[PDB]
Amino acid sequence: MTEYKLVVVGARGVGKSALTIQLIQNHFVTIEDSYRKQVVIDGETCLLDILDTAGQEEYSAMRDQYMRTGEGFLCVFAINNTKSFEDIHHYREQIKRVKDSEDVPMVLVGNKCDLPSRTVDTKQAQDLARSYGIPFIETSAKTRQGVDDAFYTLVREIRKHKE
Amino acid sequence: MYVKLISSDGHEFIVKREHALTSGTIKAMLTNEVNFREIPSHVLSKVCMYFTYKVRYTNSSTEIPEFPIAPEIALELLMAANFLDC
Amino acid sequence: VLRSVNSREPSQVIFCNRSPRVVLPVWLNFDGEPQPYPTLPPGTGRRIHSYRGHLWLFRDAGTHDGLLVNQTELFVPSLNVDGQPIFANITLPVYTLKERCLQVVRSLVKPENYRRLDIVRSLYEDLEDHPNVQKDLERLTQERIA
Amino acid sequence: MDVFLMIRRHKTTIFTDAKESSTVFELKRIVEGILKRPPDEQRLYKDDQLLDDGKTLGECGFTSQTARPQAPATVGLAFRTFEALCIEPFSSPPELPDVMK
Ligand SMILES: CC(C)[C@@H](C(=O)N1C[C@H](O)C[C@H]1C(=O)NCc1ccc2cnn(C)c2c1)n1nnc2c1CC[C@H](CCCN1CCCN(c3nccc(-c4noc([C@@]5(C)CCCc6sc(N)c(C#N)c65)n4)n3)[C@@H](C)C1)C2
Numbered sequence: 001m002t003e004y005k006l007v008v009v010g011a012r013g014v015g016k017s018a019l020t021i022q023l024i025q026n027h028f029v030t031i032e033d034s035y036r037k038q039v040v041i042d043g044e045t046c047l048l049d050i051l052d053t054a055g056q057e058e059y060s061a062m063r064d065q066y067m068r069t070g071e072g073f074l075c076v077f078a079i080n081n082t083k084s085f086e087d088i089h090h091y092r093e094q095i096k097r098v099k100d101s102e103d104v105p106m107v108l109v110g111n112k113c114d115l116p117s118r119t120v121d122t123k124q125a126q127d128l129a130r131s132y133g134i135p136f137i138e139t140s141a142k143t144r145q146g147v148d149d150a151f152y153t154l155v156r157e158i159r160k161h162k163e
Numbered sequence: 164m165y166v167k168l169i170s171s172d173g174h175e176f177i178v179k180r181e182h183a184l185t186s187g188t189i190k191a192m193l194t195n196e197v198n199f200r201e202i203p204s205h206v207l208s209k210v211c212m213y214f215t216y217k218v219r220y221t222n223s224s225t226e227i228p229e230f231p232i233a234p235e236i237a238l239e240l241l242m243a244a245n246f247l248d249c
Numbered sequence: 250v251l252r253s254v255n256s257r258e259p260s261q262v263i264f265c266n267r268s269p270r271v272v273l274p275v276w277l278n279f280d281g282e283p284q285p286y287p288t289l290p291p292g293t294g295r296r297i298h299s300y301r302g303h304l305w306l307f308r309d310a311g312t313h314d315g316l317l318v319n320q321t322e323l324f325v326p327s328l329n330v331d332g333q334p335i336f337a338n339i340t341l342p343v344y345t346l347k348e349r350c351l352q353v354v355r356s357l358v359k360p361e362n363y364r365r366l367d368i369v370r371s372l373y374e375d376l377e378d379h380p381n382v383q384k385d386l387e388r389l390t391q392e393r394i395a
Numbered sequence: 396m397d398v399f400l401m402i403r404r405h406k407t408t409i410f411t412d413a414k415e416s417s418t419v420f421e422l423k424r425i426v427e428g429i430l431k432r433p434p435d436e437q438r439l440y441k442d443d444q445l446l447d448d449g450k451t452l453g454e455c456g457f458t459s460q461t462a463r464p465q466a467p468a469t470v471g472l473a474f475r476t477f478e479a480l481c482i483e484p485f486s487s488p489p490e491l492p493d494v495m496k
């Protein structure tokens with residue numbers, strides 16, 4: 001059994017903790033912590049190590065190498081927060097810096113897809129995720145909509161990256 | 164204005180003075196013909212090529228090509244490059 | 250003394266490796282330490298998101314040789330005008346014939362076999378003085394004393 | 396756009412430059428300015444093909460891509476009752492030391 005360290009990056013209040021809480025416990029509800037769950041993906045039992053990033057922003061040698069350990073990243077934004085979509089670029093810059101590679105298994109995630117007033121169109125996120133060469137998935141931490149899809153597709157990106 | 168640089172095997176290289184002035188040794192020794200007692204022709208011919216490469220790209224604002232050096236000349240050229248101070 | 254300013258003001262920059270070498274971008278942090286960045290293959294370009302007042306220099310990725318950016322050894326991004334990027338062109342410098350010969354010999358002889366050569370002892374030392382960046386930061390500060 | 400060349404005859408070699416649009420005869424005036432021989436008594440060769448006095452250096456194969464300053468192109472020279480073009484080779488480099496193989 002191989003382990004897959006997954007990191008969840010994003011802006012404040014986009015549902016980074018809420019996404020992990022459903023993937024771990026199927027139990028939708030508060031600090032930077034790491035969670036582990038054994039799941040079967042593509043008929044293959046593997047261990048998931050989810051680190052929900054949180055707190056103030058910091059670029060220390062501690063925090064850099066802590067993010068370096070992750071094998072794949074979820075870049076999460078809220079569809080009703082325009083800033084969270086236009087912030088995705090900065091998270092990808094730092095991911096590519098600490099991993100020291102322009103090809104890192106990543107996936108753009110649009111959460112909070114259960115609210116009526118969306119301010120970020122789906123076309124904007126498809127044109128952005130195409131420029132990064134990464135998959136895009138609309139999720140909802142309230143209804144489990146694509147919560148398995150968002151996490152499982154990243155594991156396929158890491159298994160593809162294996163050279 | 165051209166100066167004359169003679170190698171150890173009688174090969175004389177005619178090169179402009181401002182190009183030969185790159186060498187700190189050649190600069191001090193001149194006063195129109197310069198002889199070399201232990202630098203062969205295949206080494207002095209390459210040094211004269213560096214003089215052209217030097218003056219041509221020393222203030223170039225664009226990209227500059229690499230100066231090619233073959234392995235069979237690299238060791239002998241380093242001795243000549245050391246003596247000439249260029 | 251040679252350090253980046255903590256401006257927190259973004260500035261999009263384009264790095265361009267117009268050298269036949271693999272270029273190593275070196276960022277001078279706010280404390281003056283050189284921090285390397287992902288390398289650039291020969292003949293490539295990248296849209297870097299740097300910040301105003303940040304110091305940059307570029308070296309050969311392997312041999313740590315010196316390289317020029319816009320015909321100078323340092324790069325500070327300005328402020329972008331009308332959203333235009335800022336182009337940093339990386340070229341080879343005119344290496345002295347002595348230094349170029351050293352680079353070629355360093356790439357063909359293992360450092361354990363430097364002393365097995367038939368060169369003079371003055372050159373045996375020059376071979377083992379591989380370029381370090383700290384001595385280059387030390388001189389560059391002394392060079393800008395005016 | 397300049398073209399960088401080596402004018403070689405016997406054990407002599409001239410390192411000079413010229414624009415690609417300049418004439419072969421114009422180059423013979425430069426050779427005359429070093430080697431005291433008139434252009435009527437000169438015969439320039441690119442490899443072993445006689446260069447016509449009216450053509451430009453580019454019309455002879457000399458381009459800034461094939462005639463770089465760090466690797467200039469060779470032009471044979473014959474003086475005059477003309478001689479046969481004779482370029483003496485340079486010295487030969489020594490065998491590669493075993494540490495550099
Ligand atoms: C400190 C340096 C990073 C530096 C800097 O950027 N430089 C220095 C040279 O000029 C070049 C430039 C740089 O590196 N370009 C990127 C790059 C990439 C590849 C290549 C290849 N070649 N080159 C040359 C490259 C360059 N620098 N200097 N001044 C500043 C900075 C960084 C930014 C500072 C101010 C930003 C303000 N923010 C606050 C508001 C919200 N925001 C926010 N809110 C919460 C969290 C985060 C966040 N961000 O990342 C992360 C994670 C967790 C994920 C992910 C991996 C890591 S790792 C680590 N430690 C993390 C953390 N905390 C993270 N979470 N973001 C973001 C969007 C803006 C001003």
Ligand SMILES: Nc1nc2c(ncn2[C@@H]2O[C@H](COP(=O)(O)OP(=O)(O)CP(=O)(O)O)[C@@H](O)[C@H]2O)c(=O)[nH]1
Nearest residue numbers: 011012013014015016017018054055112140141142
């Ligand atoms: N409607 C809706 N609300 C959601 C969803 N996911 C999270 N939220 C809401 O977002 C708020 C904050 O989300 P949270 O999971 O704490 O996000 P976070 O990115 O971990 C915030 P921090 O970075 O500060 O830890 C909560 O009020 C929660 O109810 C979702 O899918 N739909």
Ligand SMILES: [Mg+2]
Nearest residue numbers: 017030031054
């Ligand atoms: Mg949280």
